[PDB]
Amino acid sequence: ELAFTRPYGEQEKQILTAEAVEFLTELVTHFTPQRNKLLAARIQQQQDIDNGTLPDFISETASIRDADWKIRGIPADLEDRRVEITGPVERKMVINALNANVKVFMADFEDSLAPDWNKVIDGQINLRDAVNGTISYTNEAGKIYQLKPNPAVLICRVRGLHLPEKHVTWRGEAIPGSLFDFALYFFHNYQALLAKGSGPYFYLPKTQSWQEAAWWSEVFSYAEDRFNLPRGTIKATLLIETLPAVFQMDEILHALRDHIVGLNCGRWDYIFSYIKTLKNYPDRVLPDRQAVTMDKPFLNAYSRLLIKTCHKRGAFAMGGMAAFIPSKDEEHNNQVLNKVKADKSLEANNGHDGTWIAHPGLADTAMAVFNDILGSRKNQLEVMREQDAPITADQLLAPCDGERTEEGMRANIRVAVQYIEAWISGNGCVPIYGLMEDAATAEISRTSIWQWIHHQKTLSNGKPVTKALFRQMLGEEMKVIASELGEERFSQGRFDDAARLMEQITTSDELIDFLTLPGYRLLA
Ligand SMILES: O=C([O-])C(=O)[O-]
Ligand SMILES: [Mg+2]
Numbered sequence: 001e002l003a004f005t006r007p008y009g010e011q012e013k014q015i016l017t018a019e020a021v022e023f024l025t026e027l028v029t030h031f032t033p034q035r036n037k038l039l040a041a042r043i044q045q046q047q048d049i050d051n052g053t054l055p056d057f058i059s060e061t062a063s064i065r066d067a068d069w070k071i072r073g074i075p076a077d078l079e080d081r082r083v084e085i086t087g088p089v090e091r092k093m094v095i096n097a098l099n100a101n102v103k104v105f106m107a108d109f110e111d112s113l114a115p116d117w118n119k120v121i122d123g124q125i126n127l128r129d130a131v132n133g134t135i136s137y138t139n140e141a142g143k144i145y146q147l148k149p150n151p152a153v154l155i156c157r158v159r160g161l162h163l164p165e166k167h168v169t170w171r172g173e174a175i176p177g178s179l180f181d182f183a184l185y186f187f188h189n190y191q192a193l194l195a196k197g198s199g200p201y202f203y204l205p206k207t208q209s210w211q212e213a214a215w216w217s218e219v220f221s222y223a224e225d226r227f228n229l230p231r232g233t234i235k236a237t238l239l240i241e242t243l244p245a246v247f248q249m250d251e252i253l254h255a256l257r258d259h260i261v262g263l264n265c266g267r268w269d270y271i272f273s274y275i276k277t278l279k280n281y282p283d284r285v286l287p288d289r290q291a292v293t294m295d296k297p298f299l300n301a302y303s304r305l306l307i308k309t310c311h312k313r314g315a316f317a318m319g320g321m322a323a324f325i326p327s328k329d330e331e332h333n334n335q336v337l338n339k340v341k342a343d344k345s346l347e348a349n350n351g352h353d354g355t356w357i358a359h360p361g362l363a364d365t366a367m368a369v370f371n372d373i374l375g376s377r378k379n380q381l382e383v384m385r386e387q388d389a390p391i392t393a394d395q396l397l398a399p400c401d402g403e404r405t406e407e408g409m410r411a412n413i414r415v416a417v418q419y420i421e422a423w424i425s426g427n428g429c430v431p432i433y434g435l436m437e438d439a440a441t442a443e444i445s446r447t448s449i450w451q452w453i454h455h456q457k458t459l460s461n462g463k464p465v466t467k468a469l470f471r472q473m474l475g476e477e478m479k480v481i482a483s484e485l486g487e488e489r490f491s492q493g494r495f496d497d498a499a500r501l502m503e504q505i506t507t508s509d510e511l512i513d514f515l516t517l518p519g520y521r522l523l524a
């Protein structure tokens with residue numbers, strides 16, 4: 001049986017109904033052991049890379065890659081996804097996102113949410129109310145927020161396979177957060193979603209292998225069968241946002257063929273994963289974060305391969321997001337929108353079927369680019385990129401050299417520390433220096449600093465990057481943060497705890513896989 005570590009309040013009584021908990025228990029008991037074996041398999045596969053065998057395509061599955069076959073199908077309401085907005089599962093946010101000038105809202109339990117128990121439960125309440133069409137919110141000023149006609153299509157992003165949900169245990173251990181988030185969104189909403197001609201749709205993050213995709217396929221099939229739904233009722237879009245996964249896109253599509261409708265270039269997790277996965281290769285060190293842009297060869301190759309591979313199988317190839325926040329200053333906002341427009345134009349011209357935004361102020365820009373290139377069509381499924389030569393492992397793994405600067409290092413410290421401080425305080429997405437920071441973008445910043453220390457890289461000013469240099473810069477940059485935020489905000493925050501965690505993970509000889517793992521220990 002499952003144990004719940006917190007007493008039920010009114011919200012738990014809504015979400016954790018006896019029937020919901022029975023269903024969750026079935027998924028946990030049927031699928032948790034296999035999930036743990038998958039996490040163990042990751043260790044061995046990384047060790048093989050660490051020991052000198054770089055990633056490449058899989059030998060034995062060549063027949064799958066060179067065969068003609070397609071995914072099972074795409075629901076009518078997922079035929080046009082030219083712009084999707086992402087946002088966390090907070091109540092007002094859900095309403096504003098569903099009302100935005102977009103096709104889809106991806107409600108997030110993952111990288112943009114700090115997974116406090118109350119926020120995960122409230123998130124399930126909010127999405128149920130949203131599916132049911134009744135969600136409403138009135139703020140302090142007495143302004144009421146409700147869904148407008150024709151709200152966006154809803155897709156739920158669950159926590160990744162590594163994340164525990166520690167407030168529910170089974171056999172003395174936290175259950176998988178992935179199963180918690182999936183089970184409850186599916187269970188509470190499948191009936192209403194299906195009744196209105198939609199379905200239970202998910203975004204699946206941080207996949208590393210086709211076997212992980214196969215596990216999801218088993219989870220989905222079990223869920224469908226439990227409630228006597230037709231096969232392929234549950235539809236997933238799967239982020240290719242780890243370096244191992246870019247070599248297994250066709251195998252992933254095949255393993256999830258009954259449920260999958262698309263892959264997505266999760267560029268920020270992908271860059272983070274490039275650093276983590278190639279941590280033991282001194283020639284694969286990435287430069288200042290702002291220099292790692294989608295026009296760089298390795299990233300352009302990743303996108304073009306994803307586009308060709310998805311379209312070969314009749315699946316969508318979704319783009320990602322640039323992470324620039326609109327400005328309240330008009331002149332400055334013009335510059336922001338011009339760079340967002342440029343980023344989207346690259347995606348649309350390459351053949352992506354749609355793109356992401358994380359702020360409604362970007363919707364008109366993103367929609368205009370996609371409206372222009374799509375014309376009378378709903379997507380770009382027909383774009384096969386036959387002009388492209390084969391894309392090879394050497395191309396996907398190519399170094400990407402650039403300046404490693406003191407300013408870049410200090411910025412990474414400031415970003416990582418401030419992100420950790422927000423996250424441990426319950427805020428998983430925060431604006432910093434005109435950029436939207438969530439777990440993946442902060443992960444790049446902290447992992448980059450570790451990488452420069454690990455390989456004893458020099459900064460462009462000749463300064464050797466060391467644990468000592470980092471520790472001094474950490475204290476110095478904390479003073480900068482205090483000065484920027486003011487005495488009240490800084491003193492009332494958790495910057496002491498954040499700096500401590502940052503120092504621990506940064507000066508460890510081993511690279512921790514995710515900052516969210518030790519970070520979770522600071523959550524109630
Ligand atoms: O998921 C994302 O947004 C990413 O990793 O880029
Ligand atoms: Mg609408």
Ligand SMILES: [Mg+2]
Nearest residue numbers: 241266269440
């Ligand atoms: Mg991601």
